[PDB]
Amino acid sequence: FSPKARAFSDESLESYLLRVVSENFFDSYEGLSLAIREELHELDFEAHGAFPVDLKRLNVYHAKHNSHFRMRALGLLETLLDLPRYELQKLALLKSDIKFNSSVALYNNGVDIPLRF
Amino acid sequence: ELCNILKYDRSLYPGKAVFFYKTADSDFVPLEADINKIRNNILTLEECYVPPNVEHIFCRFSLRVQANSLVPSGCSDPEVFSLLKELAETFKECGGYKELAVRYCRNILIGTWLWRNQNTGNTQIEIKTSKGSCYLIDNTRKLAWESKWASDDLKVLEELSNEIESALTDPNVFWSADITAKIEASFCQEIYPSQILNSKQFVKAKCADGRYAVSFNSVKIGAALQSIDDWWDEDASKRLRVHEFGADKEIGVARRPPDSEQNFYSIFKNTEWYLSALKNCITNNEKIDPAIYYLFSVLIKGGMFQK
Amino acid sequence: TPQFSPKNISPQDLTHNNILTLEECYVPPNVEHIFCRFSLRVQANSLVPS
Amino acid sequence: FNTELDELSKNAEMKLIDLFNKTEFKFIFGDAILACPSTQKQSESHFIYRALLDYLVTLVESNPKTKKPNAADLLVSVLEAATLLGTSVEQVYRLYQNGILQTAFRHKMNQRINPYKGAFFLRHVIEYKTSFGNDKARMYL
Amino acid sequence: MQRYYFTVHFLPKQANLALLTGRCISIMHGFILKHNIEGMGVTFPAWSDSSIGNEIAFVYTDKEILNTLKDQAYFVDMQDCGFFKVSQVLAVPDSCEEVRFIRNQAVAKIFTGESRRRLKRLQKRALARGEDFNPKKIEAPREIDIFHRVAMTSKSSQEDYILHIQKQDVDCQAEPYFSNYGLASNEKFKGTVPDLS
């Protein structure tokens, strides 16, 4: 499988991936997910363990304890789906150490947002 | 508050999980390891793989379920005994055992209990219950905890969870199930049963004819079924094996440390508090506190805890 | 501690194991029935003190 | 600085007394992490520090995760880890306390980590740092 | 006729011996192929049943070529770094004490990958001949005597593998005929080396 659709300037990670599975191909995102789960399992077990099946908990800030493994999984996902390097990693909502007065924050390209917003 | 001789008997009794394959003549050929010895202070190296002409391999075990989580097995204090009895009855009538039973049942259906052999091929799981039911999963490789299933697999999950929940709550019902996985083996696929600690040796089950068949320890299958604890934090990366301090074996540090209030004993000190919370949760769309789910998952694990 | 306070030993030592050397008895595979037999003798020893 | 660090990568296999996953980082590269100017100020990174790390990011890029160990399996100590994260040493011990960063061998219960002994792999210590996004990452361009 | 030798001693206590022993044998292998040398032997002076030692020694008849092999890049580099102790080219005491270090390939059959490879080949060959593929298993567990590992990398195929080395004792000196790792492979090559301590 080789998706030809490419990310926009301000397109979300979920948006782009749903637009990858919008190509017919796979019937639903789950079918694609389980097929990549299989290929990660055959490649790297740690990245397989990190990569979730659902679209719910796929953004980097959801993973408190396996962020490094999530990035790995995402990088292997790029490598495996015939995409250029960093292609998924620029759409990711990354982690941020800055506190908004005891409020954990979230990082988009240049900008850090309070998680309440 | 806590007693001298408080102890619980476990609720889930899984057997040894034997590996075998079926030929034209025999329908139980035990999978034997290859022993190599070296040198007399002899070292024994054992390796296990599927024989060349065999195309399917089977992992089978029995699971029997008693209702040994309603009253403690031993106790000094009568008020504690009456408190825990009424707490168990309250938790049962609220319908939390159903939620625990579903999680226990899901691990059986996705082949967690096949540890390093899980999703190496197209695994199907057959489940024959003591009540004359027969469930079939068809492909283990298409399921996952967080994935949404087909109605067939959800009907299997619903029915088997109902049978396990009834077995977990009724003392006058004897319930057992025979669970077989059939895995499509590749050409001489390496198989990972349980090893001895002490060289490299495998946990064997001696057949009636004298031959030794590689297998999993009952404790290991248990550890797989009872891998449900993701209540320790909201965004939990994994599901832990139910432990009193939430000990993670792979990473090697406790997720419910003794300093915290989320370890078993800190939650066990607030039973009379959680009873009133559960009594308020009766008649009420209100969800049960995850601390009580963790509590009852430890009580379904059992223990000879404090002291 | 005896009065419920956590003593500070390594965070990694809590997930640490104990090696147990046990004896285990399981039914051999595809053995349908197990048997338990004992013999009982009854004597009239409660009529008179020995 | 790149050409100085390039010859240490090419001649890494030459110096080996043990395997890559058992050898420390300072055994091959030598002091080049803990000599670097600290980023305790503001969380404003030094131009020397920005140039060092951006070489290590392309090192793990060229060395993918295979069954043979390579230059990206070199062991890094808690002080060298503290500099690469740009945080206090207690904060990096606290990540070890909640098993966020995973040592590379199990200490047996009374082992408190020696702050100079190489504990963590270079590999996932970088991937943890690429999980946190800052403006001048190579991802955007 | 007088067989000269030198010895490379590995000084660090934390040194992976299979790695360093492989590096030394690979460099000798490379040198032999470059210069077209025949009769070069390898001996392990500090060979135990626990392990191969910190010492590896190279045994040959010419003195100049051993001096040329002593003056290779890796040896002087790892001597400068202070990990190696390289001896001068000394004549063998030439009294007796002959042994034979063999690369025993049969040891490789105790691992699953070998059985899988070997059966895949037998299947193809049995299928090619036109008969049914039905191999029969052994009844006795495989008996092997103590062997030590030497880690070796194929630069041609970029493949990591291991030499299973076994030590045998012989009475008196045989002809110097060895493999390209100087390692007397127990039927094809019957080359003996002097026992050093």
Coordinates of C-alpha atoms in Angstrom, one line a residue, chain D:
Chain D
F1 CA 33.0 20.0 14.9
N2 CA 31.0 17.7 12.4
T3 CA 34.3 16.3 10.8
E4 CA 35.8 15.9 14.3
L5 CA 32.7 13.8 15.3
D6 CA 32.5 11.9 11.9
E7 CA 35.9 10.1 12.3
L8 CA 34.8 8.9 15.8
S9 CA 31.7 7.3 14.2
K10 CA 33.6 5.7 11.3
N11 CA 36.4 4.3 13.7
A12 CA 33.9 3.3 16.5
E13 CA 34.1 -0.5 15.5
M14 CA 37.9 -0.3 15.6
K15 CA 38.2 0.7 19.4
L16 CA 35.7 -2.0 20.6
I17 CA 36.9 -4.2 23.5
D18 CA 33.2 -5.3 24.1
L19 CA 29.9 -5.0 22.1
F20 CA 28.2 -1.6 21.4
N21 CA 25.3 -2.3 23.9
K22 CA 28.0 -2.9 26.7
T23 CA 30.4 0.0 25.9
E24 CA 29.9 3.6 27.3
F25 CA 29.6 6.8 25.1
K26 CA 32.8 8.5 26.6
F27 CA 34.8 5.3 25.6
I28 CA 34.3 6.2 21.8
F29 CA 33.5 10.0 21.7
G30 CA 35.3 11.1 24.9
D31 CA 33.9 13.8 27.3
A32 CA 32.1 15.7 24.4
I33 CA 28.6 15.7 26.2
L34 CA 29.6 16.6 29.8
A35 CA 32.1 19.3 28.6
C36 CA 29.3 21.0 26.6
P37 CA 28.1 24.4 28.1
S38 CA 25.0 23.7 30.3
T39 CA 21.4 24.9 29.5
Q40 CA 20.4 25.7 33.1
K41 CA 19.7 29.3 32.0
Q42 CA 16.1 30.1 30.9
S43 CA 15.8 26.7 29.1
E44 CA 17.8 28.7 26.4
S45 CA 20.1 26.2 24.6
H46 CA 23.8 27.0 23.8
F47 CA 24.9 27.2 20.0
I48 CA 27.5 24.5 20.8
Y49 CA 24.8 22.3 22.5
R50 CA 22.4 22.9 19.5
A51 CA 25.2 21.7 17.1
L52 CA 26.2 18.6 19.2
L53 CA 22.6 17.1 19.7
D54 CA 21.6 17.8 16.0
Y55 CA 24.5 15.5 15.0
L56 CA 23.3 12.8 17.5
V57 CA 19.7 13.1 16.0
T58 CA 21.1 12.1 12.5
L59 CA 23.3 9.3 14.1
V60 CA 20.2 7.3 15.3
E61 CA 18.6 8.2 11.8
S62 CA 21.5 6.4 9.9
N63 CA 21.6 3.6 12.6
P64 CA 18.1 1.8 12.5
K65 CA 17.1 -0.7 15.2
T66 CA 18.3 -4.1 14.1
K67 CA 19.4 -7.4 15.9
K68 CA 23.1 -6.5 15.5
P69 CA 24.0 -3.6 17.9
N70 CA 25.4 -0.4 16.2
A71 CA 26.8 3.1 17.3
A72 CA 23.2 4.1 18.6
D73 CA 23.3 1.4 21.4
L74 CA 26.2 3.2 23.3
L75 CA 25.5 3.6 27.1
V76 CA 24.9 7.2 28.5
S77 CA 25.2 8.1 32.2
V78 CA 22.5 10.1 34.2
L79 CA 24.6 13.3 34.0
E80 CA 25.1 13.0 30.2
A81 CA 21.3 12.2 30.0
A82 CA 20.6 15.3 32.2
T83 CA 22.6 17.5 29.7
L84 CA 20.8 16.0 26.6
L85 CA 17.4 16.6 28.2
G86 CA 18.6 20.0 29.6
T87 CA 17.0 19.4 33.1
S88 CA 18.1 18.9 36.7
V89 CA 19.6 15.4 37.7
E90 CA 16.8 14.7 40.3
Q91 CA 14.2 15.3 37.5
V92 CA 16.0 12.6 35.3
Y93 CA 16.1 10.3 38.4
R94 CA 12.3 11.0 38.9
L95 CA 11.8 9.8 35.2
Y96 CA 13.7 6.6 36.3
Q97 CA 11.5 6.5 39.5
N98 CA 8.2 6.4 37.4
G99 CA 9.9 4.1 34.7
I100 CA 9.6 6.7 31.9
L101 CA 13.3 6.3 30.9
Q102 CA 14.3 2.6 31.0
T103 CA 17.8 1.7 32.3
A104 CA 19.7 -0.9 30.3
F105 CA 20.2 -3.8 32.8
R106 CA 18.4 -4.6 36.0
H107 CA 20.0 -3.4 39.3
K108 CA 19.4 -6.0 41.9
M109 CA 17.2 -4.3 44.7
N110 CA 20.0 -2.6 46.7
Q111 CA 21.5 -1.1 43.5
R112 CA 21.2 2.7 43.6
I113 CA 22.5 3.9 40.2
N114 CA 26.1 5.3 40.2
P115 CA 25.8 8.8 38.6
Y116 CA 28.9 8.3 36.3
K117 CA 28.3 4.5 35.3
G118 CA 26.6 4.4 31.8
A119 CA 22.9 3.5 32.6
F120 CA 20.6 4.3 29.6
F121 CA 21.1 3.7 25.8
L122 CA 21.8 6.7 23.5
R123 CA 18.9 5.4 21.3
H124 CA 15.6 6.1 23.2
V125 CA 17.1 9.0 25.3
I126 CA 17.1 10.9 21.9
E127 CA 13.6 9.5 20.8
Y128 CA 12.3 10.9 24.3
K129 CA 13.9 14.3 23.3
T130 CA 12.2 14.2 19.8
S131 CA 8.8 13.5 21.6
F132 CA 9.2 17.1 23.0
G133 CA 9.0 19.6 20.1
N134 CA 11.0 22.9 19.9
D135 CA 11.0 25.4 17.0
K136 CA 14.4 24.5 15.3
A137 CA 13.7 20.7 14.8
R138 CA 14.5 19.3 11.4
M139 CA 10.9 17.8 11.0
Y140 CA 9.2 21.1 9.6
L141 CA 12.3 21.7 7.3

